[PDB]
Amino acid sequence: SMTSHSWLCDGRLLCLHDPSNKNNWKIFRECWKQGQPVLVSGVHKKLKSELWKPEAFSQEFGDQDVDLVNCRNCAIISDVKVRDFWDGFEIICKRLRSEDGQPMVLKLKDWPPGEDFRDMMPTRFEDLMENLPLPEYTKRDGRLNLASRLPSYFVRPDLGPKMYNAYGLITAEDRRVGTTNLHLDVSDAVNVMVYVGIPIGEGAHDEEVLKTIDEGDADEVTKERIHDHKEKPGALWHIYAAKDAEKIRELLRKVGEEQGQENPPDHDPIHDQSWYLDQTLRKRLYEEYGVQGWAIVQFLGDAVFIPAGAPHQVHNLYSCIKVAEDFVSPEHVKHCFRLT
Template sequence: YNYGPRGRDPLPIRIMTKTESSLLYPGVAHSWLCDGKLLRLLEPLAPGNTPLFQDQWKRGQPVLVSGVGQKLNPDLWNPQSFSKDYGDIKNDLINCLTGNIVPNQPMKKFWEGFEHYGKRLKDDKGQPMVLKLKDWPPGDDFAEMLPSRFEDLMSVLPMGEYTRRNGRLNLAGRLPECFVRPDLGPKMYIAYGSAIHPNRASTNLHLDISDAVNVMCYVGVPKDADYEEHIKEALKAIDEAGCDILTRRRVREKEEIPGALWHIYHARDSDKIRDLLNKVAIERGDKLEPHHDPIHDQAWYLDGPLRERLYKEYGVEGYAIIQCLGDAMFIPAGAPHQVRNLHNCVKVAEDFVSPENVSYCFHLTQEFRHLSDTHTNHEDKLQIKNIIYHDMKDAMACLMAASKEIQIKSEVEESVEKKVKESDS
């Protein structure tokens, strides 16, 4: 690492080929997407994954892990099981086409329309809505409300030392029991597909204060609509999204089911993205309000023309990634990203705080303080200062204990050596 006036400089982005990485990490099943920038691990629970994962992660690069879904219990993650178990619960839904909230709807109605276009809730014009269920269950512990699904997910979640609540490399797990635990999930993100609605996001451009892993547990296509048309539109969206040739081949030749289209950018490029979005807003005649932020406000989706301007005017190129059924997407803290569901998706996300990105977590907390008091991110819900303090305290305790052991061992050896010399004399 190099250290500048503002602290540690980020490591340069690494671009690899399979030939190079196979020599450095023999025996690790993997490939490279996004022209060599995106690591794709192929065996989610293989112990040899960690060094390769860490070498990408410390550079602030996202990682894709495939094969997680093959280890999940499929009976727990389909629409029918959710409708049966939680259909009577009411929840607010979001219309992805307008951003409007559809309040207090029985979950059964949402699930009935998940794979049946004709059963979907309709808007004021009588058109079926593209609905999203975000951050569910709200305010409840996933482990308590969905215990069987929690156990199933935790048993297959890759990079467990980072992603488990008690993982050694999940710094959030070091908070003492007397503290209110930050809500790091898991949370479910379930949305209808929008392949036939170009440039409409399931989740607009935003960034998160912590690291996250997002698992695609189920992908469905409407059974009462034109199946071939939906597949065709999804493939068209992939072709227009800037995906590399290997990604496009994956969803065509490998017959994998594409669920969501992601665009992820490096955390270090956030200010350039903000600058572009503010510039575009001014060009459109919008007024820039104080204490608001174009990324944190989640008001933008970077479509093709905006992504092209970002590259031409700022030299910023992100990752165009297709998350297929069973893929786990690792997103570093502070990395701006947006998601568009091509088909109907059931996703589960777990947040964590890794040593590699804790500095971004801290700086983002400071950044959020400048947002308006009404902004959802204004408050430090992560308690990052408490996390850093107690992690440092535990680390120092371990170092002091190890140092004391070494000192005692050295004193014992000196004492034995002295006695041997005395006996010899």
């Protein structure tokens, strides 16, 4: 039967089932006040699906200049055309190649650039903002969004949304690599998976995707969404409570030292955005520091709510289009305050 919600991560993660249910706030707010992330499924069904395809982005915007990142070695590919990224999104034999002759795993950097999303893509902007879940929190003028209401004593988020476009990681070696490394944001955010691209030509790597989710520490209820409902999995997240950020810094300082980095004892390895916590680092965090995280698989249409100050990392399983909006909830406004 249709139900209001369910639990993931063995009861530690709320999953809301209907993105436009006017009563969601009653379940949401209790979980949110405790510093937990929240998942809302089904947002894809509310969107105009023709607006969120890689072929449309290539056709409409393909002549713009951009930089890309090689996810495997963090190298920048400077001043290429945006079509060079999009035309390889699903067709592997069209991807830019590394010196070694392999197709590259690429991320499109800062596109649309800065705050231009609304000006460049006015129809996409309308379609996203009108269909965000928890609208009193997430809309620019929502009754519980303080972004437009705070003085300069608080860091205000840039006008959004922001897009995250990147290929899926492929090999066993790629399992230890991040699409986006561990970092934190001083505002809350909602991140929506608007498109998942399962490739062709080398499209058959369905079994390395299961070993990544399994080793990623994903829960048994999550593994059932694949095998039983045939939903398309985009990305594996790890999120940590804001209260655990300093223990995470202590671990990454210890590991930097062991790997012979030379860092001052105050340096911030989370702000550096230089680490991805692989299965080894996540076990060590748990055992040596007492810190447990939320391992989340974001499927097509899943909205991930990320609390202000919560460290998080993302590993694309397949090619993804994500769109995120920043907001400032009253629950987490401490995280953006400039004093004490």
